[PDB]
Amino acid sequence: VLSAADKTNVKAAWSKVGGHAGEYGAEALERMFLGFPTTKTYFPHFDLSHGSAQVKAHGKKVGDALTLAVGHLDDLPGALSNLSDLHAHKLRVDPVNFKLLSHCLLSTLAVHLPNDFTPAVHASLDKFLSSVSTVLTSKYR
Amino acid sequence: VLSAADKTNVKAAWSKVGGHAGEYGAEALERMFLGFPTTKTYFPHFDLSHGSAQVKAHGKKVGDALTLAVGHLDDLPGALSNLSDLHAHKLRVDPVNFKLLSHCLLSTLAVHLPNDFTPAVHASLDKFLSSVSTVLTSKYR
Amino acid sequence: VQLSGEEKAAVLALWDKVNEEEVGGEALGRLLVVYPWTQRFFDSFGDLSNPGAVMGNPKVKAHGKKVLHSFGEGVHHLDNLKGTFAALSELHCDKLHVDPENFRLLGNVLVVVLARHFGKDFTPELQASYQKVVAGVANALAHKY
Amino acid sequence: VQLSGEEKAAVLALWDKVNEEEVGGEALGRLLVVYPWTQRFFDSFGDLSNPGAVMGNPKVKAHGKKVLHSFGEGVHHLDNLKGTFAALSELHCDKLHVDPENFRLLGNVLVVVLARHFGKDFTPELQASYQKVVAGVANALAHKY
Ligand code: HEM
Ligand code: HEM
Ligand code: HEM
Ligand code: HEM
Ligand SMILES: [Cl-]
Ligand code: NA
Ligand code: NA
């Protein structure tokens, strides 16, 4: 599914993210909640207001999980197993919402990394986020 | 995507399909063309009328490819590589069309194997057809 | 969302043969089994943990019948679907927050259940007509989005 | 497909600064690179085999401008999207047979290009407003199905 070129594109792109993975995760969440309000249904216990500390905290965990995935491109099912259990079994997140967050993530990267967000990197990050979504929405136990 | 239980169901269900794989592929194709005329764009050289020798012949190749996939569930990217190149790089088939054929192929199995098309087998063949679709629509070579 | 004179007649002849009890329950049950994330909207129905509990759930069978009765309204009001499903569309968007993609899924599962019940009588052209009907209902239900 | 008065004003103010040629060319180019199956509809444009050839293709830049100009007509007729895209809907649905899912894809790509060009000025609330716009365009373009 992911070619070797995609893996190296994702690897290099995420090296540009560097220590900002949490900030970008948080901003992506903020863009998703405002742009697709249905997604707020999955966080009824969150303070979703402007500057919310909960969103910032959750974004850090989303960013950290993606960094982990970037380091296990060759075995995402095994590396993300615990996260698949939470999202597919416990939380039963509609797969549609993963397309929305992926789009909001790419938007965030486009804002902060305009010179590095080339079409090819764009295309490889899209494949990457799609493969991560498939793992997190699947019951493969 | 595919669990151990899914593989067992798929293999067992496909043993009931047996030698009807070609018939079912052809009927599935015919249901797609009538039910989704958009799919007719990819066969401008075919007689899509009922009982066509081209459709029946083409259906045989789809049935055979699925039978091949059933014996290589653990390495679909490797076994379906040549067909992935054909559909993604050469033919550039819109991924939406694989969902339409998958639905039409499940419709066909429901017609001919109603007592074996249980909810559990239904659920596993759908996962199976999605994994085959993902391989055939990905440029990973 | 337009059918020929023979199409609508053929669609209705098959609908007369639909068991209003089994088909609705089986289609909804298959939706919860094959697309497990849909179970999230039915937590109040009880045990949905395995296909046996879902397919034998009395609340699933009851609600399935309601769903099939609403599909029936679509088969008999093709030329005014947008108005027929106004209230249901509002229900699923403002209150339930069901993504329109799931309307398509239930619509295809229903088709698969019809195919299972009627076998070779569910011809490709007859299915093609029901794909039109199922798409129209799904589109009418998502109009409030 | 309705925005508030403050939303409309913000959407219109940003479009005053949109270079329809640069944004259009980049948006169409990214569609062909990120979703390669869309290349099938543009074989007469020539070599689309790699992003370099796609992003520098003059026919891609020209058509992208046309496409973005049509988004502009939608941005200036938010209350009449169906009538504004009626002819283009027939072209894409009855004559080209383009699946509606790709309309949504091109709208999200456009948003990503807008985000890349305007940076921090493309705020989350401003993006939220344009997500509504692109969805409105996408549904209007698919109304003929
Ligand atoms: C690439 C996609 C995603 C990644 C990498 C991801 C990552 C994570 C992580 C790391 C956690 C751990 C939370 C914790 O330990 O406190 C989590 C939980 C959670 N996820 Fe996601 N997630 C993704 C997509 C989504 C989407 C699309 C939704 C819904 C629209 C969602 C809803 C939730 C919720 C509700 C929780 C629990 C939050 C809490 O109870 O504190 N996730 N996710
Ligand atoms: C499970 C899904 C599918 C399978 C297993 C499959 C399998 C195959 C096979 C085995 C071939 C011939 C390979 C060869 O001759 O080397 C083929 C060719 C082809 N496929 Fe598919 N296919 C699938 C889905 C689709 C879909 C969804 C479309 C379009 C809507 C499509 C369009 C075509 C076309 C146009 C050809 C070439 C026809 C010709 O050469 O005359 N396929 N496919
Ligand atoms: C063509 C597709 C559908 C039709 C025709 C349909 C029809 C209906 C009907 C008739 C009701 C009863 C409303 C009432 O009694 O006032 C209902 C309620 C409901 N629908 Fe559906 N529906 C469809 C799709 C879906 C889907 C796909 C889901 C979730 C995945 C869903 C979730 C619900 C829920 C949770 C309720 C409320 C259940 C309850 O409170 O007992 N619907 N729908
Ligand atoms: C989503 C928003 C879209 C808009 C607003 C749009 C708009 C347009 C416009 C303005 C034209 C020019 C018609 C003319 O010059 O007479 C056109 C033509 C065309 N469109 Fe699009 N389009 C969209 C998406 C797509 C997509 C997703 C595809 C295919 C994947 C597509 C394929 C085509 C083709 C093949 C043509 C004809 C090209 C030619 O003149 O040779 N369009 N569209
Ligand atoms: Cl590039
Ligand atoms: Na189906
Ligand atoms: Na994108």
Author numbering:
A (entry chain C), B (entry chain A): 1 to 141
C (entry chain B), D (entry chain D): 1 to 145
The authors write:
Equine hemoglobin was the first protein structure to be solved at high resolution, and is a model system for the study of structural and functional aspects of radiation-sensitive metallo-proteins. Serial femtosecond crystallography (SFX) at X-ray free-electron lasers seeks to extend the sensitivity and applicability of X-ray diffraction to structural biology. The method greatly increases the exposure of a crystal beyond conventional limits, and without the need for cryogenic cooling, by using femtosecond-duration X-ray pulses that terminate before the onset of radiation damage. Gas dynamic virtual nozzles (GDVNs), which focus the liquid stream with gas to diameters much smaller than that of the nozzle orifice, have proven to be a robust SFX sample delivery method.
Through extensive prototype testing, we identified a DFFN geometry with 75-µm sample line and 70-µm gas orifice diameters to exhibit optimal performance properties (Design 8). The low jet speeds of a few meters per second are well matched to the measurement frame rates typical for low-repetition XFEL sources and state of the art synchrotron sources. Crystals were prefiltered before loading into reservoirs and injected with no filters in the line from the reservoir to the nozzle. Diffraction extended to the edge of the detector and thus probably extends to higher resolution. A twofold non-crystallographic symmetry was observed in the crystal packing, with the whole biological tetramer (A2B2) present in the asymmetric unit. Electron density around the radiation-sensitive heme co-ordination complex was not indicative of X-ray induced damage. This confirms that the low-speed jet injection approach with our 3D-printed DFFN can reduce sample consumption rates when determining X-ray structure void of conventional X-ray damage at low-repetition XFELs.
